[PDB]
Amino acid sequence: TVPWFPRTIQELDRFANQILSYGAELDADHPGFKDPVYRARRKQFADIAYNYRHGQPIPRVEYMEEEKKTWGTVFKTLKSLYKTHACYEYNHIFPLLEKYCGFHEDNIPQLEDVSQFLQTCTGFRLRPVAGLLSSRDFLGGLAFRVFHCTQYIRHGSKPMYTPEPDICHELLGHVPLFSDRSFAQFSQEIGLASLGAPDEYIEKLATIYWFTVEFGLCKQGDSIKAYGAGLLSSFGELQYCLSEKPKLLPLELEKTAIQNYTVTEFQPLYYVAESFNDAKEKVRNFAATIPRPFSVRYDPYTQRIEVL
Amino acid sequence: TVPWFPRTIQELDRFANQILSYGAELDADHPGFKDPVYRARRKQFADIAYNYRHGQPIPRVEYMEEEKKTWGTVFKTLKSLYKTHACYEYNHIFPLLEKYCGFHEDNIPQLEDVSQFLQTCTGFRLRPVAGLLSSRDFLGGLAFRVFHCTQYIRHGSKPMYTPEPDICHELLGHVPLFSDRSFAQFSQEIGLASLGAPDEYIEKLATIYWFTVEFGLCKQGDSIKAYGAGLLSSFGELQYCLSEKPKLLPLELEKTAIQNYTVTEFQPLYYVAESFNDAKEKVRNFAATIPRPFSVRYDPYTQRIEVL
Ligand SMILES: [Fe+3]
Ligand SMILES: [Fe+3]
């Protein structure tokens, strides 16, 4: 029996009661494990995500001096690499983020302001997320152009390191690409392909997502640039991915879908997309091979999924 | 008159003439009921188990392409959840299983290689089992650190579903925990407690086994993780058990022993163990309340049970 999936954008509210309740900050090797203030601050962000409901403005939060310092360190260090490593779409929108969303070393941007900006560019919007969503729920939100976003920041003891996404990764890595119209369409196809798909295919789409949205490389002119969020928020891997060390392969979904990857070291290989439009087309073709007893359409006018 | 129980490890050979001779694959709603090739393949595995005798290497089998495909689908889909849901002991040993036992998407590990690896870690060993062993015989083997293991695989028509243990469940669910020394001691106490126990107590130990070895949750740091084999080999219940939905209760054997459970839907509640050593201690105390006119000791040097 087809697995449940949201049919309207409000139904995404059901995901809150389906996350992993025991977060990473509870593990003994998390950088802030022994810090009780950090632990409490993380619970505070989780309660905000838990009570959030579609349609409400995302709560603004006053970040502490220590958290602002961590953000500033990450921002300054990564910014130096963008003009030469990041793709054209990233660099084209960044100045607008500095100007209208407050992306600066001394200030952590508030998610509501960022969500409104994204809405104006492509209709994408953010919602705060407690802990880890299953792959199915996470990809499902993309169908409605909704991105589940963390609002907390990594522990300040290791500013250049995080074992989980945190706000620096969401804002410096994902956000700028969601402002591009073709990228937005591309990431929404992944979402649409996932609706009602069997569990084994969700894992394939999750693997495609990892090799594009998180760790993708794309052709630009006769050069190669990074557009993956995990690359764009990682100082070391960003420099590494455009050196001679990694193996580069053209994006071919049949192969990409079953490629193994490690989450703990730099990637041994990356897939290169010709463009986001082309990647979008490939996802759509791949989606036609997923055994679903139906077809889906998103109606942006009413924010509902039509089932055919 | 005290029910019979094996006194040496070879006597486990008597169990073969005591299984349920009419297996689940003979029921009309088994996924492979109408598949005559599957039916024959299942008989083939049953004959291997039937003729196996203690001391012989377990026969190697060449799995068909179709069976390998089913294993690959299950393995890929479950692997994605281990680093975040499975307990530390599971994750610590998995890489060694990939490296020395051939745990990979394209290959089904052979039981003899797995048994030799287990022997090296904790002295546990496997033996192939035909059909369903009574609870008494099944728990009795644990006293000798022997685990009765299925060698056949579920029908390929429903790779994410099985109404019975099959090889995916044994290898991805049980095996990794049997490589941990404390878990091995803990599961052996359950076995020792069962020897010569009255039928009504065997059912209590069977219920304790179900809520620990099959569906147990354990404390780790300040977090909670899965160690039950039924959870670790079930994609859906693994995500569900660490969400906010189930009721969690501390492991208390007096209560756990009489708790009812359903075998057909996700568990409404789970018992949380403090650690395997602590669970081991509780089984031992509980075992002292079982009315037996004697006491038992396992002598690992001669592989015999001493009766005191
Ligand atoms: Fe990310
Ligand atoms: Fe089992």
Distances (CA, A) of A125 to A147, B12, B47, B66, B123: 6, 63, 60, 44, 56
First vs last Cα of chain B: how many Å apart? 17
> If we measure between CA atoms, which residue out of B267, B234, B228, B274 comes closest to residue B250?
B274
Give the SS3 label for residue B12.
Answer: helix
The answer to whether B160 contacts A198, with C-beta atoms less than 8 Å apart, is: yes
The answer to whether B220 contacts A27, with C-beta atoms less than 8 Å apart, is: yes
By CB atoms closer than 10 A (0-12, 13-18, 19+), residue A195 is buried
Length of chain B as a residue count: 308
Dihedral class, residue B297 (left if φ above 0, else alpha if ψ from -120 to 50, else beta) = beta
Distances (CA, A) of A114 to A65, A88, A95, A101, A212: 21, 20, 14, 6, 22
The answer to whether B235 contacts A26, with C-beta atoms less than 8 Å apart, is: no
The CA angle A168-A86-A143, to the nearest 5 degrees, is 65
> If we measure between CA atoms, which residue out of B16, B157, B72, B174 comes closest to residue A260?
B72
Written as one string, the DSSP assignment of A204-249 is: HHHHHHIIIIIT-EEEETTEEEE--HHHHT-HHHHHHTTSSSSEEE
By the CB criterion, residues less than 5 angstroms from ion ligand 2 are: B 165, 229
Instruction: Tell me how many helices (H) and strands (E) chain B has.
Output: 12, 8
Distances (CA, A) of A75 to A41, A55, A171, A226, A267: 21, 30, 10, 17, 23
In chain B, positions 127-166, which contact chain A (CB-CB < 8 Å)?
Answer: 159-160
Of all ligands present, the nearest one to the C-alpha of A228 is: 1
Task: Round to whole Å and give the CA distance between B36 and B214.
Answer: 31
If DSSP states are collapsed to H, E and C, what string results for A149-161?
Answer: ECCCCCCCCCCCC
Q: Which two tokens stand for residue B43?
A: 């008989």
> If we measure between CA atoms, which residue out of A261, A241, A55 comes closest to residue B76?
A261
Q: Where are the alpha helices (DSSP H) in chain B?
A: 36-51, 65-85, 88-100, 111-122, 135-142, 167-168, 181-194, 199-209, 229-232, 235-240, 253-256, 276-287
- Burial letters A52-61, b for 16+ CB under 10 A, else e: beeeeebeeb
Extents of the domains making up chain A = 1-308
For the beta sheet containing A217-220, the strands, ordered from the edge strand earlier in sequence to the opposite edge, are A223-226, A217-220, A269-273, A247-250
Distances (CA, A) of B149 to A17, B104, B155: 37, 19, 17
Please tell me which residue in B30, B85, B155, B169 is annotated as part of the active site.
B169
- Asked if residues A178 and A188 have their Cβ atoms less than 8 Å apart, the reply is no
Written as one string, the DSSP assignment of chain A is: ------SBGGGGGGGGGGS-SS-GGGSTTSTTTT-HHHHHHHHHHHHHHHH--TTSPPPP----HHHHHHHHHHHHHHHHHHHHHB-HHHHHHHHHHHHHS--BTTBPPPHHHHHHHHHHHHS-EEEE--SPPPHHHHHHHHTTTEEEE------TTSTT--SS--HHIIIIIITTGGGSHHHHHHHHHHHHHHTT--HHHHHHHHHHHIIIIIT-EEEETTEEEE--HHHHT-HHHHHHTTSSSSEEEE--HHHHTT----SSS--SEEEEES-HHHHHHHHHHHHTTS--SS-EEEETTTTEEEE-
Written as one string, the DSSP assignment of B61-121 is: ----HHHHHHHHHHHHHHHHHHHHHB-HHHHHHHHHHHHHS--BTTBPPPHHHHHHHHHHH
Task: Round to whole Å and give the CA distance between B21 and A243.
Answer: 63
- Asked if residues A283 and A186 have their Cβ atoms less than 8 Å apart, the reply is yes
**A174 labeled part of a ligand binding site:** yes
Q: Which residues contact A65 (CB under 8 A, 6 or more apart)?
A: none
The answer to whether B236 contacts A19, with C-beta atoms less than 8 Å apart, is: no
Give the SS3 label for residue B149.
Answer: strand
- Asked if residues A70 and A166 have their Cβ atoms less than 8 Å apart, the reply is no
Of all ligands present, the nearest one to the C-alpha of A173 is: 1
- Asked if residues A268 and A246 have their Cβ atoms less than 8 Å apart, the reply is yes
Q: Sign of the C-alpha dihedral, residues B133, B137, B142, B145? A: negative
Residue A210 C-alpha, separation from nearest chain B C-alpha, in angstroms: 12
Q: Which two tokens stand for residue A131?
A: 């802990």
Task: Round to whole Å and give the CA distance between A246 and A232.
Answer: 16
Experimental method: X-ray
The answer to whether A28 contacts B245, with C-beta atoms less than 8 Å apart, is: no
* A40 interface with B at CB cutoff 8 Å: no
Q: Which residues contact B37 (CB under 8 A, 6 or more apart)?
A: none
Q: Report residue B270: phi and psi, to 5°.
A: -130, 155
- Strand B125-128 to strand B146-149: parallel, antiparallel, or no bridges (unpaired)? parallel
* A19 interface with B at CB cutoff 8 Å: yes
A205: closest chain B residue by CA: B77
> If we measure between CA atoms, which residue out of A96, A71, A257 comes closest to residue A170?
A71
B67 classed as catalytic = no
Q: Report residue A268: phi and psi, to 5°.
A: -70, -30
Distances (CA, A) of B75 to B107, B143, B294: 10, 30, 45
Residue A24 C-alpha, separation from nearest chain B C-alpha, in angstroms: 8
> If we measure between CA atoms, which residue out of B131, B148, B156 comes closest to residue B71?
B156
The answer to whether A132 contacts B222, with C-beta atoms less than 8 Å apart, is: no
* B76 interface with A at CB cutoff 8 Å: yes
- Asked if residues A205 and A197 have their Cβ atoms less than 8 Å apart, the reply is yes
- Strand A217-220 to strand A223-226: parallel, antiparallel, or no bridges (unpaired)? antiparallel
The CA angle A160-A166-A171, to the nearest 5 degrees, is 95
**B30 labeled part of a ligand binding site:** no
B174 classed as catalytic = yes
| Top-tier CATH class for B1-308 | mainly alpha
* A35 interface with B at CB cutoff 8 Å: no
**Which positions in chain B touch A258 (Cβ < 8 Å)?**
76, 105
* A50 interface with B at CB cutoff 8 Å: no
The answer to whether B84 contacts A132, with C-beta atoms less than 8 Å apart, is: yes
**B104 labeled part of a ligand binding site:** no
First vs last Cα of chain A: how many Å apart? 17
CA contacts within 13 A on the Cβ side of A234: 25
**Ligand 1 centroid, distance to A147 Cα (angstroms):** 10
In chain B, positions 268-307, which contact chain A (CB-CB < 8 Å)?
Answer: none
Task: Round to whole Å and give the CA distance between A285 and A181.
Answer: 20
A257: closest chain B residue by CA: B76
By CB atoms closer than 10 A (0-12, 13-18, 19+), residue A263 is exposed
Q: Report residue A146: phi and psi, to 5°.
A: -120, 130
